[PDB]
Amino acid sequence: DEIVNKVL
Amino acid sequence: RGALSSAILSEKPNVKWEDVAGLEGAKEALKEAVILPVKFPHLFKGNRKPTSGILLYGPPGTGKSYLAKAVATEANSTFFSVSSSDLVSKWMGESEKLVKQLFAMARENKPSIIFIDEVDALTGTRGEGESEASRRIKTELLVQMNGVGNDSQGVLVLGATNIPWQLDSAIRRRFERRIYIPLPDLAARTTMFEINVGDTPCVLTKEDYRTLGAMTEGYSGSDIAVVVKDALMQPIRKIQSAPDLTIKDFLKAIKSTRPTVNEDDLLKQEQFTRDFG
Amino acid sequence: NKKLRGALSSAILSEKPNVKWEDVAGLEGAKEALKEAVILPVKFPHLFKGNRKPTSGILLYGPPGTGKSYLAKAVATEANSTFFSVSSSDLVSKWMGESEKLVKQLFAMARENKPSIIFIDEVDALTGTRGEGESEASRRIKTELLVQMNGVGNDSQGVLVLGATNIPWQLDSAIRRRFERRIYIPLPDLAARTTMFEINVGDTPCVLTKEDYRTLGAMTEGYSGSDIAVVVKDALMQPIRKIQSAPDLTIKDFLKAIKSTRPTVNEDDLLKQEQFTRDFGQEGN
Amino acid sequence: NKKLRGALSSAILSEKPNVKWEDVAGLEGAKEALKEAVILPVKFPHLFKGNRKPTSGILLYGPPGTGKSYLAKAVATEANSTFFSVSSSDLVSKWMGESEKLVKQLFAMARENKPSIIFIDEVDALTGTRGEGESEASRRIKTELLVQMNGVGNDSQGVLVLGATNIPWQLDSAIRRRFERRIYIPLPDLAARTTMFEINVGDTPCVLTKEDYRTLGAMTEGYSGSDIAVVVKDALMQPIRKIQSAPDLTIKDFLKAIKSTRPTVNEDDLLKQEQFTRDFGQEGN
Amino acid sequence: NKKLRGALSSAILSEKPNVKWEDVAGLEGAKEALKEAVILPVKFPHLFKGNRKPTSGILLYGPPGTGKSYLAKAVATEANSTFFSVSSSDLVSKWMGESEKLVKQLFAMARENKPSIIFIDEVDALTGTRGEGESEASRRIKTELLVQMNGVGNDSQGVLVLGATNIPWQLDSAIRRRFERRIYIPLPDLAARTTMFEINVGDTPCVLTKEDYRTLGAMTEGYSGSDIAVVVKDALMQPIRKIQSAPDLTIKDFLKAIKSTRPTVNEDDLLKQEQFTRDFGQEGN
Amino acid sequence: EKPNVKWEDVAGLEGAKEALKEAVILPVKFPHLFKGNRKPTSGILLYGPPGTGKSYLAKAVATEANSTFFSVSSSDLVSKWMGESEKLVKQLFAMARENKPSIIFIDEVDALTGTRGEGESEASRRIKTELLVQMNGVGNDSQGVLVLGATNIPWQLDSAIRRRFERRIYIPLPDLAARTTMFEINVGDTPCVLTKEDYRTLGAMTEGYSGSDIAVVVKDALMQPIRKIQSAPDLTIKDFLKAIKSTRPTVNEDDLLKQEQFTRDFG
Ligand SMILES: Nc1ncnc2c1ncn2[C@@H]1O[C@H](COP(=O)(O)OP(=O)(O)O)[C@@H](O)[C@H]1O
Ligand SMILES: Nc1ncnc2c1ncn2[C@@H]1O[C@H](COP(=O)(O)OP(=O)(O)O)[C@@H](O)[C@H]1O
Ligand SMILES: Nc1ncnc2c1ncn2[C@@H]1O[C@H](COP(=O)(O)OP(=O)(O)O)[C@@H](O)[C@H]1O
Ligand SMILES: Nc1ncnc2c1ncn2[C@@H]1O[C@H](COP(=O)(O)OP(=O)(O)O)[C@@H](O)[C@H]1O
Ligand SMILES: Nc1ncnc2c1ncn2[C@@H]1O[C@H](COP(=O)(O)OP(=O)(O)O)[C@@H](O)[C@H]1O
Ligand code: BEF
Ligand code: BEF
Ligand code: BEF
Ligand SMILES: [Mg+2]
Ligand SMILES: [Mg+2]
Ligand SMILES: [Mg+2]
Ligand SMILES: [Mg+2]
């Protein structure tokens, strides 16, 4: 499954 | 299949064309895009094709979703009220087949009107978005809304929004009649008070509703629905404390209730109308 | 399906925090609106027929510490309705549109268990005016909250959506529209402060009179209800300090506490609160 | 759930840094408040019944190097509780709303093992007034900390939340509200400085008398406790250096060190500290 | 875990740059402090017991080009301990609070390899007074560096944190506190310049005498050690230009180079350096 | 990467030409004269006004080097993603360490390195700082790389980076023989009736022009006869005089005062 990361 | 067929509603919210107050251009365009192809299908032959996309925009609370309910009652179509909750998925390559399935079942159920409500949440300019959700959805949707000649029955793609300037220019192109739903003027406000009091026993006259409609400049239709809600509560205050409807009930409600739209939101709406609408 | 209900089974609270409408001090108007939106539809359901529909959204705002969450506890005791208390920890999942699938499931549960109350505490952290926010969290959680509150095929019958906030001017205008009675909870006045001292001392043996509580209530202008709860907390510690440096509660204990404890809210925050009340709001009295 | 508790299992410290209440010098008021909020509820739990509840939040602030983290070590030795010690490295994560199920299951760990203490060191880096911050970190970690500290269905019984900071004016007003005793830890005074020299020389053989330590304490006005710890460090490294240029301790060793070592603080930082103390704070004595 | 150690495996340097203490000219105070903080704890560990602890932070500052990084190379050769020469490229990452775990992971690696030295070159780029900086990089990298250097549950035993900077007045006061011996590395004097010419000519055949090097050292007032390294570079490149332009080294080669090469520094930068040394600093001699 | 460009190809300023022929060829043609204390130069800052043939001289060193050449520039190292503008720098120096000898040509270094008194926290301190530490540093080994760099604003450069560039050479507005050479080159093999005294005449006519301007007066003069073809021939000196009357340069004679300032103080 294509999970979301989070950036700066 | 059995995951997008929770887009078809079937309860038919009973709003008829004589409940929206004013908005006659919008009723005119919606009639000649929805009612008239079905009732006289011989006319649309040759170069004369029906419209295949209509965007309604405006400030918040002025009639967009409500007019979509009026279409949903009066159309005699099959009506998909789809949204971004029902198209996006974890598994890659599901937000391709889901849009594709949507339009294929719309052509199972011709005539079809599809109401993609708040299109700015699907279609977000693709310069910062994530891989799966933003790109393959918006490209597949652009393709399937490039069905010009084949979609002569079936898909009329409505759509409402409050932020019409945050919309991608290819999708501004696909919606070929951007109509603007504004805050209502005097006759419409008087009509909305007369509708929203319903069949409730009141001592009011035509000059009373005329008075209130003169009093409420700046209010949208939501606000007048809630001043009628509060003013209809006023008898139960006069029973608890620990009768007829007066005009002091409405003056009481209008003193207490305060408008919703801010007068710079209107500047950017008028901006977009003057540039593209 | 059942994985998600296994997640949201821990939101149906089951303990009834015993705050009653008299444990709230002040606030005639906010209790009045909340009673005629929560208590009265259940107790006399024959009245609400025809054009007369109950209220389906109430926003409470104010400075910090003035009664918002507490009044929500009073509703949670007195309502006799299922009281969901949800927050941003319980809606933002990791997994591509669960933060919309969770919201939709939330109101689907609150329609199968009607009459229900959904208390979204600190709604300004979900709903942030969408001009600077990110794509997913912004457009998709805000958008599913909008469409889910009124929408087309959605039927907000018998659900009520409360909500409290401290920054009511940072709220999106579509969600300012959905909350149809923005009530303002202010800092307490003289009679309210005197009432809060009389409540918070409880049944503790004290030599104080009505003019003593009246004196303290005259002394504390600028304090919210939190601050008076902590000056009563500190002043109730004063007999222990006696009984170690060596009884009754006697007015030098309270004067001692009021000298030591200092206000919490400043006086420009109040200018922006009064701004929003004058532009969009009710008056909570 | 258990993935997150597997992350935050390494925050409940267990080595008990052996600082006892003797070893702090000055600050009778801060030790007094911390004792009657930490030691006394456990040792005499029959007292705290009725309206008399223990304190559930204490903010220590001050200039750099004056005793805040050290006094937290003293609590960590003397408390007999499950002392956690968490920080901003251990709450912020990468995957989208994991940075607040960490906050939630931190406080749920402290509820399963009550009476607990949560020591959030340097709280101004989590909690930054939310008018300019980003969506996820700002609104969601700050908001889950707020709702989790008092909230509706949350029951902060028997947990205590410490916290230290150097910039107490950059703190959000809702979180200034949650910390209900803002104590101020100041730069030292004469008796405290004399006590710190007597402590830091330890059991080292010296010819010094009480009037010698009294002399040095008179000599060092303006120094914080760090600076006196390093003049004792350098003065203890004077005889090794005389071994290298060729004994017990002369007062010329300490005068030598105090000439060479120069303080840390300045004198407008103190104006903003005194500002905050005069507007919202206590006095740590 | 192992992803992060895969990142920081490229910091344990493994080549020992052969600079010895003799090569570094002048500056006996800075060599003295660095020897008694690096060499002496390892060579005689029985001495440091009780109250006598080694130094755990040393800041070198000065004008550009005067010896700071070079003296750090001398420590890296002579120390016999694990040396991490970390920098700003190796601590910042993109994914929302994965920078902090590299800081924490760096010191948690350094206590596996004790004794250790951490040399943070140009610390003024991490630590920028936090009054104008951004939320994440500012509060979270600075804050994790603070808490990680002394903190509560952290145990800075046997690690040393060096650091060099050219702008020592733009440093945060908590981090000015953590560096407990701010030594100042100045522009060289006469004997140092003469020593640097004698070193940099190496074993090259020259007709020069002691009074010749003495002459040049008298000639070059205002030059840093970089400039004298490049006038020796240019003066050594004269003979090749006398083979192309058509041998032995005579003082006209150096006068030729000194005429052509022009300095680097500027005499108000020195006023702010002397300012900081007079307000907070040691003297590197 | 070696297309044609040569030491023969360039016009004027043999001080620059000899400093560079030295600093690249003199180690590469002879790696056994540089032993002991005698090390080659590891940084050269060219500057000047625009148009004066800086980057062309750099690519003359690219062809004429037998060395690798990385013509990165300030357009390609700006990012906006929290410490991405540094890993680009570091991996650049990694492929330059792995591939000795190398040349790194940072074109318009004044856009990375801006005196740090007004700049922002991250980009100022972090790109400038990683460039500093990466050029000499501790564990870094600048063996066999040469860091070039060109700029037009050499006074807006940070003093630590003015220190790292150890030969600041100044490329000035050119003389007479160079201009005559550039006309003779840029006409190429095109049939023209011009003589040596004609090119000599034009070179006398064009004082103040950089090499760009003479490349565009030759461009325009080569497009005069086709223009009289299709909106209705040969190459006259009146064609070039026509073009030089129409085409105008860039420069101002106070920009030269601050250039000469920096050359007299540091260059
Ligand atoms: N033209 C209208 N006629 C009748 N009621 C209206 C009209 N416009 C608004 N209202 C009232 O406002 C309510 C809100 O309408 P709604 O569909 O939510 O507006 P929109 O979607 O633009 O924000 C309507 O359901 C009705 O209560
Ligand atoms: N109006 C009030 N009447 C009685 N107690 C109050 C009142 N306002 C505050 N309190 C006390 O102060 C505390 C703070 O109330 P709380 O609900 O947390 O405030 P809020 O959520 O606005 O910040 C409550 O627990 C209660 O103990
Ligand atoms: N009040 C004090 N009594 C004794 N030592 C003190 C005191 N204040 C500071 N110190 C010394 O200061 C050193 C460093 O102070 P520290 O614990 O870091 O304070 P903080 O965290 O506030 O900066 C402590 O290790 C201790 O040696
Ligand atoms: N005191 C000194 N003794 C010997 N060499 C020196 C000295 N100062 C500078 N150098 C020369 O300077 C270079 C080191 O740069 P450095 O002085 O470390 O710059 P910074 O100190 O600004 O980091 C080496 O070439 C070294 O030869
Ligand atoms: N002095 C010069 N000698 C020879 N050719 C030049 C000269 N100046 C410019 N040119 C030609 O003009 C073109 C552009 O020059 P360039 O070096 O890019 O300008 P700048 O130095 O301003 O960046 C080059 O390809 C070059 O061949
Ligand atoms: F115009 Be509405 F708010 F959809
Ligand atoms: F909910 Be409170 F006003 F902080
Ligand atoms: F006061 Be310290 F720097 F925590
Ligand atoms: Mg709508
Ligand atoms: Mg609250
Ligand atoms: Mg500390
Ligand atoms: Mg250096």
DSSP E62-78: -STTSSHHHHHHHHHHH
Nearest CA in chain A to C95: A3
Contact predicate B122/B137, CB 8 Å? yes
d(CA C102, CA C92): 8
Burial class from Cβ neighbours inside 10 Å (0-12, 13-18, 19+) for residue F207 reads exposed
**What distance in angstroms lies between residue C60's CA and the mean position of ligand 9's atoms?**
23
Query: Which residues in chain C precede a discontinuity of more than 2.5 Å between C and N?
Result: 246
Chain C CB within 8 Å of residue D32 CB: no
DSSP tag of C118: E
Chain E CB within 8 Å of residue F162 CB: yes
d(CA C121, CA C141): 16
Burial class from Cβ neighbours inside 10 Å (0-12, 13-18, 19+) for residue C20 reads exposed
**For residue A5, which residues of chain D lie inside 8 Å, CB to CB?**
94-96
Cβ distance B92 to A4 less than 8 Å, yes or no, reads no
Phi, psi for residue E137 in degrees, rounded to 5: -60, -40
d(CA C118, CA C106): 9
Residue whose CA lies nearest to ligand 3 atom number 13: D226
Contact predicate D244/E43, CB 8 Å? no
Phi, psi for residue B114 in degrees, rounded to 5: -120, 130
Strand partners, C161: C118
Length of chain B: 277
The reply, when asked if residue F52 is annotated as ligand binding, is yes
Diameter over CA atoms, chain C: 72
CA F150 to chain centre: 6
Rg over CA atoms, chain B: 22
**What distance in angstroms lies between residue C224's CA and the mean position of ligand 10's atoms?**
13
Contact predicate F183/F235, CB 8 Å? no
CA distances from E221 to C261, E215, E250, E254 (A): 63, 11, 21, 15
Cβ distance A3 to C94 less than 8 Å, yes or no, reads yes
**3-class DSSP state for residue D160?**
strand
Q: Domain extents for chain E?
A: 1-187+262-285, 188-261
Strand partners, E9: none
The reply, when asked if residue D165 is annotated as ligand binding, is no
Of the CA atoms within 13 Å of residue C204, those in its CB half-sphere come to 25
Burial class from Cβ neighbours inside 10 Å (0-12, 13-18, 19+) for residue F189 reads exposed
**For residue C230, which residues of chain D lie inside 8 Å, CB to CB?**
180
Contact predicate E84/E116, CB 8 Å? yes
Contact predicate D182/D282, CB 8 Å? yes
DSSP tag of F144: S
d(CA C97, CA A2): 11
Who contacts B22 (Cβ-Cβ below 8 Å, separation ≥6)? B184, B185, B187, B188, B191
Closest CA to F106 of F121, F124, F128: F128
Who contacts D79 (Cβ-Cβ below 8 Å, separation ≥6)? D38, D39, D117
Concatenated DSSP letters of E96-141 = SS-SHHHHHHHHHHHTTS-SEEEEEE-GGGT--TTSSS-IIIIIII
Diameter over CA atoms, chain A: 23
Reading the block at residue C90, the tokens are: 């319980």
Closest CA to F161 of F181, F177, F147: F147
d(CA B265, CA B267): 5
* Structure determined via: cryo-EM
Contact predicate D178/D136, CB 8 Å? no
Q: Distance from B85 to chain A by nearest Cα, in Å?
A: 16
Chain F CB within 8 Å of residue A7 CB: yes
DSSP tag of D48: S
Q: Which atom of ligand 4 is nearest to the CA of F160?
A: 22
Is it true that the peptide bond before B182 is cis, omega within 30 degrees of 0? no
Alpha helices in chain D (DSSP H): 2-7, 28-34, 40-43, 68-78, 101-112, 142-149, 173-178, 190-200, 210-219, 225-236, 238-244, 251-260, 269-280
Contact predicate C234/C263, CB 8 Å? no
d(CA F24, CA F61): 8
d(CA C161, CA C66): 20
d(CA C100, CA C109): 14
d(CA B230, CA C54): 10
Reading the block at residue B269, the tokens are: 């709406």
Nearest CA in chain D to E145: D89
d(CA C124, CA B208): 40
For the Cβ of D73 lying below 6 angstroms from any atom of ligand 8, the answer is no
How many CB atoms neighbour CB E6 within 10 A? 9
DSSP tag of C164: E
Question: In terms of C-beta distances under 8 Å and separation of at least 24 residues, what long-range contacts does D257-260 make, across chains too?
Answer: D257/D231, D257/D232, D258/D216, D258/D219, D258/D220, D258/D231, D260/D234, D260/E282
Q: Which residue has the tokens 């875990």?
A: E1
The protein residues having their C-beta less than 5 angstroms from ligand 12 (an ion) are E 69
CA distances from D71 to D11, D132, D232, E207 (A): 18, 33, 20, 68
Nearest 5°: the CA angle B55, B56, B58 is: 135
For the Cβ of B138 lying below 6 angstroms from any atom of ligand 6, the answer is no
Chain D CB within 8 Å of residue C202 CB: yes
DSSP tag of E283: -
d(CA D122, CA C213): 39
d(CA F166, CA C232): 72
Contact predicate E137/F121, CB 8 Å? yes
CA B189 to chain centre: 18
Q: What single letter denotes the amino acid at residue D128?
A: G
How many CB atoms neighbour CB F100 within 10 A? 11
The CATH number, out of the four listed (3.40.50.300, 3.40.950.10, 2.60.120.260, 3.40.1160.10), of the domain defined by the range B1-183+258-277: 3.40.50.300
d(CA D262, CA B39): 94
Nearest 5°: the CA angle B208, B213, B216 is: 125
Q: What single letter denotes the amino acid at residue F160?
A: A
**What distance in angstroms lies between residue B70's CA and the mean position of ligand 6's atoms?**
15
**3-class DSSP state for residue B255?**
helix
Chain D CB within 8 Å of residue C166 CB: yes
Q: Which atom of ligand 6 is nearest to the CA of B59?
A: 1
Closest CA to D222 of D257, D170, D262, D279: D262
How many CB atoms neighbour CB D202 within 10 A? 12
**Number of helical H runs and strand E runs in chain B:** 11, 6
Cβ distance D139 to C133 less than 8 Å, yes or no, reads no
Contact predicate F20/F69, CB 8 Å? no
* F1-173+246-267 placed in CATH 3.40.50.300: yes
The reply, when asked if residue C163 is annotated as ligand binding, is no
Alpha helices in chain C (DSSP H): 2-7, 28-34, 40-43, 68-78, 98-112, 142-149, 173-178, 190-200, 210-219, 225-244, 252-260, 269-280
Residues 48-87 of E with CB under 8 A from F: 64-65, 69, 72-73, 76, 85, 87
d(CA C230, CA C98): 41
Q: Which residue has the tokens 């019944």?
A: D49
For the four alpha carbons of D47, D52, D57 and D58, in that order, the dihedral sign comes to negative
Of the CA atoms within 13 Å of residue C12, those in its CB half-sphere come to 14
Contact of chains A and E by CB distance (3 or more pairs under 8 angstroms): yes
Cβ distance D180 to C122 less than 8 Å, yes or no, reads no
Reading the block at residue E256, the tokens are: 């030729």
Length of chain E: 285
Who contacts D44 (Cβ-Cβ below 8 Å, separation ≥6)? none
Q: Say which CATH architecture domain D1-187+262-285 belongs to.
A: 3-Layer(aba) Sandwich (3.40)
Closest CA to B156 of B276, B35, B8: B35
Reading the block at residue F154, the tokens are: 């050499």
For the Cβ of C64 lying below 6 angstroms from any atom of ligand 7, the answer is yes
For the Cβ of D264 lying below 6 angstroms from any atom of ligand 3, the answer is no
**3-class DSSP state for residue D216?**
helix
CA C69 to chain centre: 3
d(CA B49, CA E116): 80
Reading the block at residue F137, the tokens are: 């540093």
For the four alpha carbons of C35, C41, C46 and C48, in that order, the dihedral sign comes to positive
Cβ distance C64 to D103 less than 8 Å, yes or no, reads no
d(CA F228, CA F221): 12
d(CA D118, CA F164): 50
Contact predicate D213/D236, CB 8 Å? no
How many CB atoms neighbour CB C6 within 10 A? 9
Q: Which residue has the tokens 């940075």?
A: D99
d(CA E69, CA F132): 11
d(CA F184, CA D241): 77
Q: Which residue has the tokens 């007074």?
A: E129
d(CA D160, CA D157): 8
Contact predicate C193/C66, CB 8 Å? no
How many CB atoms neighbour CB C114 within 10 A? 11
Contact predicate B152/B50, CB 8 Å? yes
Length of chain F: 267
Length of chain D: 285
For the Cβ of E72 lying below 6 angstroms from any atom of ligand 4, the answer is no
Nearest to C128 among D135, D147, D281 (CB): D135
d(CA D56, CA D61): 17
Concatenated DSSP letters of D95-155 = SSS-TTHHHHHHHHHHHHT-SEEEEESSGGGT--TTSSS-IIIIIIIHHHHHHHHS-SS--
Q: Distance from C10 to chain A by nearest Cα, in Å?
A: 24
Q: Which residue has the tokens 């004290």?
A: C206
d(CA D99, CA B62): 39
**How are beta strands C59-61 and E59-61 bridged, if at all?**
unpaired
Contact predicate F116/F82, CB 8 Å? no
Concatenated DSSP letters of B91-148 = STTHHHHHHHHHHHHHHHTSSEEEE---GGGT--TTSSS-IIIIIIHHHHHHHHT--T
d(CA F180, CA F201): 8
CA distances from C275 to B277, C168, C175, C279 (A): 34, 10, 18, 6
Q: What single letter denotes the amino acid at residue C99?
A: S
For the four alpha carbons of F5, F6, F8 and F13, in that order, the dihedral sign comes to positive
Who contacts D236 (Cβ-Cβ below 8 Å, separation ≥6)? D201, D204, D249, E51, E52
Q: Which atom of ligand 1 is nearest to the CA of B15?
A: 4
d(CA E127, CA E140): 11
Contact predicate C119/C85, CB 8 Å? yes
Cβ distance F139 to E13 less than 8 Å, yes or no, reads yes
Closest CA to B162 of D232, C142, F61: C142
Closest CA to F241 of F205, F213, F212: F205
Nearest CA in chain F to E230: F166
**How are beta strands C59-61 and B78-80 bridged, if at all?**
unpaired
d(CA C86, CA C163): 10
CA distances from F133 to D155, E89, E169 (A): 53, 10, 20
Who contacts F94 (Cβ-Cβ below 8 Å, separation ≥6)? none
Who contacts E116 (Cβ-Cβ below 8 Å, separation ≥6)? E81, E82, E83, E84, E110, E158, E159, E160
**3-class DSSP state for residue E184?**
strand
Who contacts E179 (Cβ-Cβ below 8 Å, separation ≥6)? E57, E58, E59, E161, E163
Reading the block at residue C239, the tokens are: 């007999």
Chain B CB within 8 Å of residue C47 CB: yes
Sheet holding B78-80, edge to edge: B78-80, B112-115, B156-158
CA D194 to chain centre: 21
Nearest 5°: the CA angle D203, D204, D209 is: 90
DSSP tag of E206: B
Is it true that the peptide bond before D115 is cis, omega within 30 degrees of 0? yes
Contact predicate B65/B73, CB 8 Å? no
d(CA C152, CA B67): 10
Cβ distance D136 to E53 less than 8 Å, yes or no, reads no
**What distance in angstroms lies between residue F207's CA and the mean position of ligand 3's atoms?**
73
